[PDB]
Structures are given as C-alpha cells and as structure tokens.
Coordinates of C-alpha atoms (C1' of nucleotides) and ligand atoms in Angstrom, one line a residue:
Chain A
X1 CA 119.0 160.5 110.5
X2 CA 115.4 159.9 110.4
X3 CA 113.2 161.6 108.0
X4 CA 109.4 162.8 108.2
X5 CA 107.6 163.1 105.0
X6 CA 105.9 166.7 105.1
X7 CA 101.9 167.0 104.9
X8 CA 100.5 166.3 101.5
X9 CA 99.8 169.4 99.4
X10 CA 96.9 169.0 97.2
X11 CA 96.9 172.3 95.6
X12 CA 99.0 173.1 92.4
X13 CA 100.8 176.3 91.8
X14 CA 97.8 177.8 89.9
X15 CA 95.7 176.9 93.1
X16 CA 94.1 174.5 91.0
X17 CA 93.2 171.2 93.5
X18 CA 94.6 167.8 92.7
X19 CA 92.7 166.1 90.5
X20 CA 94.6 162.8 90.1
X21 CA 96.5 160.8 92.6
X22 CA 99.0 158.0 91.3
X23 CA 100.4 155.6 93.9
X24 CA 103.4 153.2 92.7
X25 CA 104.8 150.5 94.9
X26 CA 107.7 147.7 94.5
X27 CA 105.4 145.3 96.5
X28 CA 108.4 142.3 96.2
X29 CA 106.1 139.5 95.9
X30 CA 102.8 140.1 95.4
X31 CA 101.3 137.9 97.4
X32 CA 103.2 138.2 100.6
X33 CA 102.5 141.7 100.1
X34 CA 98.9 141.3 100.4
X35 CA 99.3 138.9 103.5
X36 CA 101.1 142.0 105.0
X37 CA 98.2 144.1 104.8
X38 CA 99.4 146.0 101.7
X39 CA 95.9 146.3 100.1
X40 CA 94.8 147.7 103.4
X41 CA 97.1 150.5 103.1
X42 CA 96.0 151.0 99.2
X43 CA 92.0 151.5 100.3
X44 CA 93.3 154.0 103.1
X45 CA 95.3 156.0 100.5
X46 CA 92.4 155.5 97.7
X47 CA 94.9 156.4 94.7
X48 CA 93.4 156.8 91.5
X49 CA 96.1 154.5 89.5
X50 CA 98.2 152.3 91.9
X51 CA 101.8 150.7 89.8
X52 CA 103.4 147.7 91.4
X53 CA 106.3 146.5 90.6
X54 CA 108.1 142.9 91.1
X55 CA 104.8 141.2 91.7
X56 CA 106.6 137.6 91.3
X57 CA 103.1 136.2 90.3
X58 CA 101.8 135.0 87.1
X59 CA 98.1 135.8 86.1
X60 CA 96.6 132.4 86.6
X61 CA 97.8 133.3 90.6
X62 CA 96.2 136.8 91.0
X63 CA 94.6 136.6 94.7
X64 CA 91.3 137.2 94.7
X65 CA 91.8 139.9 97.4
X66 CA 92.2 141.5 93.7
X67 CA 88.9 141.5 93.3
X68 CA 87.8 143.5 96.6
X69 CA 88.9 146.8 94.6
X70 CA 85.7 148.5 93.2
X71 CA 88.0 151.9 92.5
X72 CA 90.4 149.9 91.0
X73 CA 88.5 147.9 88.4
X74 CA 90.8 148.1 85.6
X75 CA 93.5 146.0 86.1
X76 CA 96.4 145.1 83.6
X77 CA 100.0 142.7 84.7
X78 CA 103.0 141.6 83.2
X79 CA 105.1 138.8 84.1
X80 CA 107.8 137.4 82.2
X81 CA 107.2 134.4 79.9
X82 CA 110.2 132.2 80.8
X83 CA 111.1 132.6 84.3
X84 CA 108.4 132.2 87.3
X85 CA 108.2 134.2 90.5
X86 CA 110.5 137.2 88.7
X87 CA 109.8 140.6 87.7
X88 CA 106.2 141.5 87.0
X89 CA 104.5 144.5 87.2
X90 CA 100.7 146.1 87.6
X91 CA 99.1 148.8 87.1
X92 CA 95.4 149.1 88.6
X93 CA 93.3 152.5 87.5
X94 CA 90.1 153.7 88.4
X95 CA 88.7 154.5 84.8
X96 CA 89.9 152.7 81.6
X97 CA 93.0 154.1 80.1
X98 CA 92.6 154.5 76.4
X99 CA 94.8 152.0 75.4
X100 CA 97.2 149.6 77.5
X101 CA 100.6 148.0 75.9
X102 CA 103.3 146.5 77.3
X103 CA 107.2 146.7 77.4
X104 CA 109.3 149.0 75.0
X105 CA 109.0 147.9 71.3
X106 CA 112.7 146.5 71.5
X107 CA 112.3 142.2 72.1
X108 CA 115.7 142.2 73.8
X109 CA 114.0 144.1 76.8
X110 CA 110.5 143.2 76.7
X111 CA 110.9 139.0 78.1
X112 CA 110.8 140.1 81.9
X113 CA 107.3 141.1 82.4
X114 CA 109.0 145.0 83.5
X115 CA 106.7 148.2 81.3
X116 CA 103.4 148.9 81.2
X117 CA 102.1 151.9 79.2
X118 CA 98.7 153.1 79.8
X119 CA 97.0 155.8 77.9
X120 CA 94.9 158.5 79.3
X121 CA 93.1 161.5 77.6
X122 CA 95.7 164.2 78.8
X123 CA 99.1 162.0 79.5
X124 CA 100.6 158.8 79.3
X125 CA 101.8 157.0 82.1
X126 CA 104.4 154.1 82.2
X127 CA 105.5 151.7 85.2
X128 CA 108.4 150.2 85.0
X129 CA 110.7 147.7 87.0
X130 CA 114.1 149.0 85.8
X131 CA 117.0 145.5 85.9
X132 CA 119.1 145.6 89.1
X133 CA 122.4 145.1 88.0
X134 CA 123.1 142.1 90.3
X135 CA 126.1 141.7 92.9
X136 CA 129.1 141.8 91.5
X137 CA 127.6 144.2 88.7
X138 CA 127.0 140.7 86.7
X139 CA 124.2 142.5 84.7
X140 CA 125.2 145.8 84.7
X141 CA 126.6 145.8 81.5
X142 CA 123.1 144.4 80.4
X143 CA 121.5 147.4 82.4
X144 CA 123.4 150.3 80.4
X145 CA 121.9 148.3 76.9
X146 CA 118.2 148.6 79.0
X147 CA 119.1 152.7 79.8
X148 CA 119.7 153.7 76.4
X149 CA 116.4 151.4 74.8
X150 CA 114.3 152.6 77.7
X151 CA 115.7 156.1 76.9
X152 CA 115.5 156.2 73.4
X153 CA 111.8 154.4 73.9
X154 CA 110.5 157.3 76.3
X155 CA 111.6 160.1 74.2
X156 CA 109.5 159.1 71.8
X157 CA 106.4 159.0 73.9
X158 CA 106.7 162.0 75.4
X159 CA 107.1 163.7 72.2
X160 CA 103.5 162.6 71.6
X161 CA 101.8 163.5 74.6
X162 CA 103.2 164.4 78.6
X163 CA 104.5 161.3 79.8
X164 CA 104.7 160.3 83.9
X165 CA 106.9 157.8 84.2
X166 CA 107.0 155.6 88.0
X167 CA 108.2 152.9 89.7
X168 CA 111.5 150.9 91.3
X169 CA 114.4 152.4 88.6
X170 CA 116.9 150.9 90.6
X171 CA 119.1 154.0 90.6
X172 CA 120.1 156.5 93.6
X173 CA 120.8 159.4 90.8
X174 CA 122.7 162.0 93.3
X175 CA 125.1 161.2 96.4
X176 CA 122.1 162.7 98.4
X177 CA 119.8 160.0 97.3
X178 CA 121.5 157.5 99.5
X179 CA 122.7 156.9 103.1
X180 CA 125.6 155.8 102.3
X181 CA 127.1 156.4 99.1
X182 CA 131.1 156.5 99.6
X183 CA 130.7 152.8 100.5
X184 CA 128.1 152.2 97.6
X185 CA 130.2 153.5 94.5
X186 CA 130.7 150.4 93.1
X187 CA 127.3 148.4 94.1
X188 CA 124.3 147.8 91.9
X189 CA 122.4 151.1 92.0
X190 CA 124.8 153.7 92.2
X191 CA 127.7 152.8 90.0
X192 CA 128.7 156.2 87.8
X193 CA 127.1 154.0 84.7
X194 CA 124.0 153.8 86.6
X195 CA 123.9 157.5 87.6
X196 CA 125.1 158.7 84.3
X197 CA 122.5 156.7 82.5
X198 CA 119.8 158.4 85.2
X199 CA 121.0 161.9 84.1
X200 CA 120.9 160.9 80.8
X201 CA 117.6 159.9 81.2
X202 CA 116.5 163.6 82.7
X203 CA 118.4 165.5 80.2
X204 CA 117.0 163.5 76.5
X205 CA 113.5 163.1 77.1
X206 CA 113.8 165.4 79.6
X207 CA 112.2 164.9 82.4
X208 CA 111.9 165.7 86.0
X209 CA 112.7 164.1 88.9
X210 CA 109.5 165.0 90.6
X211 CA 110.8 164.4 94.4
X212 CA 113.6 166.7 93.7
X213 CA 112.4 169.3 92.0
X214 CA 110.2 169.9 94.7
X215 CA 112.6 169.3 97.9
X216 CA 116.2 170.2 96.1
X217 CA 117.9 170.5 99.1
X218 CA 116.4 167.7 101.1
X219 CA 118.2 164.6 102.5
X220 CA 117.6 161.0 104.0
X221 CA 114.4 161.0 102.0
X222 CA 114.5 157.0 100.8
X223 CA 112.6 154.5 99.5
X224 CA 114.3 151.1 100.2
X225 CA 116.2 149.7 102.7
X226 CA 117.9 146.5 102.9
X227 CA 115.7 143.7 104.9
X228 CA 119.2 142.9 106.7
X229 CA 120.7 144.6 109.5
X230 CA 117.8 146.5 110.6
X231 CA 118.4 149.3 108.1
X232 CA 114.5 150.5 108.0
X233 CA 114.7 151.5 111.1
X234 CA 117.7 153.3 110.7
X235 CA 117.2 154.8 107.9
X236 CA 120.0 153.4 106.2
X237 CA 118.2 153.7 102.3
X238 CA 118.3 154.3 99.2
X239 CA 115.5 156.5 96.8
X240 CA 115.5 154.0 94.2
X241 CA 111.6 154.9 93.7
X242 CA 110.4 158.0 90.9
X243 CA 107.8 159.7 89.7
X244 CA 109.5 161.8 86.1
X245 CA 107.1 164.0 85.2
X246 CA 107.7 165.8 81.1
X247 CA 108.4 169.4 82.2
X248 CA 104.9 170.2 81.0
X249 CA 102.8 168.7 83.7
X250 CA 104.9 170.7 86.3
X251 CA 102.6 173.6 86.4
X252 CA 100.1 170.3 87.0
X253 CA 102.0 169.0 90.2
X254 CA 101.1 169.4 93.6
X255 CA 103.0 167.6 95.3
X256 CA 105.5 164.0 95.3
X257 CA 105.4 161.8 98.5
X258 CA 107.3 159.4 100.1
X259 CA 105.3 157.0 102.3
X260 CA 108.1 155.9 104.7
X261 CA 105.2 154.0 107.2
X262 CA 103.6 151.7 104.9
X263 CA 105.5 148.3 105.9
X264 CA 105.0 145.5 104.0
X265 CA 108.3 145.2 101.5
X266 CA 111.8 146.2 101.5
X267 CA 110.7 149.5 99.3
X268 CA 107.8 151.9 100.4
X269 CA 105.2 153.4 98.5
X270 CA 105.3 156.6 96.6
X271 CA 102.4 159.0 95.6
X272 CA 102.1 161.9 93.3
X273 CA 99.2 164.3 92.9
X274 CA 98.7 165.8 90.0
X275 CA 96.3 169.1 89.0
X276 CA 94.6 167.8 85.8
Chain B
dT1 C1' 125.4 146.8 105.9
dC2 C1' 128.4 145.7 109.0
dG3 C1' 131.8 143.6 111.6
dA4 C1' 136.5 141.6 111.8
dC5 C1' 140.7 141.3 109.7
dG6 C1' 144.8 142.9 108.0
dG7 C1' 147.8 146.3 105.7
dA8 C1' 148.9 151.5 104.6
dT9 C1' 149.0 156.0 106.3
dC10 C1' 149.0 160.1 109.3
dC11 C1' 150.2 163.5 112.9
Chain C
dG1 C1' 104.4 117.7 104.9
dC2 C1' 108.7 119.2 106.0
dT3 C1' 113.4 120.9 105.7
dG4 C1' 116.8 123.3 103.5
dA5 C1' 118.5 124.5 99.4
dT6 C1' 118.7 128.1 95.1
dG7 C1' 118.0 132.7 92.2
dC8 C1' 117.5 137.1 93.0
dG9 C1' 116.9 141.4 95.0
Chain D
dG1 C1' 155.0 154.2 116.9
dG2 C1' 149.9 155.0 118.7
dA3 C1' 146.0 155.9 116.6
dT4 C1' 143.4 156.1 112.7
dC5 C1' 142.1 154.8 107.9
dC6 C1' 140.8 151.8 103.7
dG7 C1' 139.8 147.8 100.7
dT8 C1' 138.2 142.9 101.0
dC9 C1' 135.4 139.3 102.6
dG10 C1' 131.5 137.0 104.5
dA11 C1' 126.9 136.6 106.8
dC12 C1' 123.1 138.7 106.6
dC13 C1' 116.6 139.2 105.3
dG14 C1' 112.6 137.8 102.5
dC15 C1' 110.0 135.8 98.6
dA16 C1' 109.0 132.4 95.5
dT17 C1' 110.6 128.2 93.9
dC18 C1' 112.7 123.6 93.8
dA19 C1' 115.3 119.2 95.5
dG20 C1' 114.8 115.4 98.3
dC21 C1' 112.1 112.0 100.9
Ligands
LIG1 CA1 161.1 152.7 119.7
LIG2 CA1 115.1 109.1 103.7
LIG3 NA1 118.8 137.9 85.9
LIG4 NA1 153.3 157.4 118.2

DNA sequence: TCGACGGATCC
DNA sequence: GCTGATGCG
DNA sequence: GGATCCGTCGACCGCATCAGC
C-alpha cells in the first residue's frame, strides 16, 4: 500500500523548536544525481548538514554545481583509494564541525571511501555507507566482520559525547521494514545475520532507531525501491535508510522524516530535526 | 521483483 | 563518437 | 484429483567505467 509521510513536527517534547535539521541521502552517483535535479530539492529543504552516500566520484570530479551552496560551505568526501566510481560519501554542513575524520580506526574497513565523523559542540555525527552483502550473499560474511568493527567503533564514540549516526545501513531491521520480507529472508539486506547484527547495533551502543521510536506501529514507510519492475511506484521497498540517535538526544528530537517524493535515485532522502 | 516452470501438498 | 559490455547495487 | 502452494531460475534498471574500433 502507499504511504504518506505525516507533516513535519518542528517542536520537541519540551516544546523547545528545532534547532538543527540533518538531511542524509544515498544519491547513487553523484553526478547523475545532480543532473536529476537533486541539489534542487536540497535548497528547497535548506538542511543544516546534508550526508550522501555512494557518490561514485572522486574529488578531482566534484561538479561545480558544488559550489552554488553558500549554506553548505563546509564540505568534506570520501572515496575509496583503489576502486573508481564505488562507494563514497559526503557530508556538507552549514558551520564548521570541530573536527572531521574519516572511516573507523580499523584499516580492514576504512579502503572504501564509506564513514565520515564530524564533530560538533553538543554531538557527534557520523555518515556511513554500510557494505551491501552482494547477490548470492558473496560479501556477507565480510559484512558481519564490518557489523561488529562498526559496532565496537560507535560505542566508543558515543561514550564520549551523543552520537547521531545516518545514512544507507543496508539493513531492513524488522519484518515491518520491508514490503516483502517472506520472499527476502535470504537476500542481501534482510538475512537474520544482517538483522541480528542491526539489533546488536541498538542494544551495545545503544541507540535508537529514530523512525521507529517515533511511528512503532507504522508500516510501508520505505526508503528504497528497486529501479526494476516499477517498484517506486508501488511501493514495493525497503527502509534501508536511519537516523540512530544515543538515547540522550531523544528528549532533543522532534521529529524523523521520510521524503518519499524526492526522485532522483533508487533511495529517497531522510531528515531529522533535532531540539539543540 | 516477478513471471514461468515444475514438483509437493492440501482439502 | 558510438555501441555494448562489466561491477555493483 | 482440482486447485493451490513453494523453491529455483532468469531478466530486469541505472550509474560509472571499460573494451573495441
Ligand atoms: Ca480417477
Ligand atoms: Ca572494425
Ligand atoms: Na565489492
Ligand atoms: Na479433486
């Protein structure tokens, strides 16, 4: 069935207004992305800190449409050293994070231009483009090694400070987080060692699945649907997309969106305001 | 994801 | 320049 | 023993890249 996105609500639990709006977005390819209007619909929303993820672009072939962003000045990427047109990842912020590093302190994981970490006065925020596990689950083996690094790396940064992690985890955690999961239980993204390693994921650091803990009981709310056989428009997806907030910045969240409209790549963008 | 195809399986 | 592949999602 | 059900295959879209000429 098709699913509506409810109206934004820009006012915390304590009443307190958003303060900070975070937009994250598997753009699959950069540069197509753009040529499909996709910085258009970025200047419309006016995030704060927009993530992208799989940006298939190395530095040296940044558009300059880039440029044309004066609330998005800062501007930090990540693409992988060995193969071209893979991976990569942005993040794009209005003010200058405190510091910036990239990947997960573990060389194994950080080749493929996936994590960056950006450092703000009251949080720290990470984007990351988590490794599909491939057809035939040829990498997932290879994925449950990235779940427990990238576990074991975010615990420790939200031990320091409240962490907001985003971006394409390539995980549908719950049966509800897909259209069709009795077909799916043994396809990249919602084998039981992906969803394990998901609740895993919420239950060590912990965190919050933002989306849900807001809308529990709420179905056909997706992020990605297959290019083929028209499943967009059917709304045959998956919510491979997160904002996970550290339980502390819940009294700080108004509200975690799903922008089902914006075209422009196989995955929609997602937004989160926060009260900061 | 979805259809076609067989080969179980169920009133 | 153009066609059609491949890797990958 | 008619209908339904269940695994197994393949083609399928799009981007960026490369092979070949
Ligand atoms: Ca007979
Ligand atoms: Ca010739
Ligand atoms: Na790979
Ligand atoms: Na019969």
């Amino acid at each position: 069935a098709l699913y509506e996105d409810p109206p934004d609500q820009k006012t915390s639990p304590s009443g307190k207004p958003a303060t900070l709006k975070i937009c994250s977005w598997n753009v699959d390819g950069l540069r197509a992305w753009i040529k499909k209007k996709g910085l258009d619909w970025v200047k419309e929303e006016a995030p704060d800190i927009l993530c992208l993820q799989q940006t298939k672009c190395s530095e040296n072939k940044l558009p300059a449409e880039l440029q044309e962003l004066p609330g998005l000045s800062h501007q930090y990427w990540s693409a992988p050293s060995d193969k071209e047109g893979y991976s990569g990842v942005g993040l794009l912020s209005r003010q200058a994070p405190l510091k910036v590093s990239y990947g997960i302190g573990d060389e194994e994981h950080d080749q493929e231009g996936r994590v960056i970490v950006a450092e703000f006065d009251s949080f720290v925020l990470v984007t990351a483009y988590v490794p599909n596990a491939g057809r035939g689950l040829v990498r997932l083996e290879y994925r449950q090694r990235w779940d427990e690094a990238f576990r074991k790396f975010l615990k420790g940064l939200a031990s320091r400070k409240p962490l907001v992690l985003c971006g394409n985890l390539n995980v549908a955690h719950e049966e509800i987080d897909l259209r069709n999961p009795k077909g799916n239980k043994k396809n990249a993204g919602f084998t039981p060692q992906e969803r394990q390693g998901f609740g895993e994921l919420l239950q060590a650091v912990p965190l919050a699945d933002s989306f849900r803990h807001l809308y529990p009981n709420t179905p056909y709310a997706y992020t990605f649907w297959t290019y083929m056989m028209n499943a967009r428009s059917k709304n045959v997806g998956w919510r491979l997309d997160y904002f996970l907030l550290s339980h502390s910045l819940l009294p700080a969240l108004c509200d975690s969106k799903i922008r089902s409209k914006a075209l422009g790549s196989d995955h929609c963008p997602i937004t989160l305001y926060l009260a900061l």
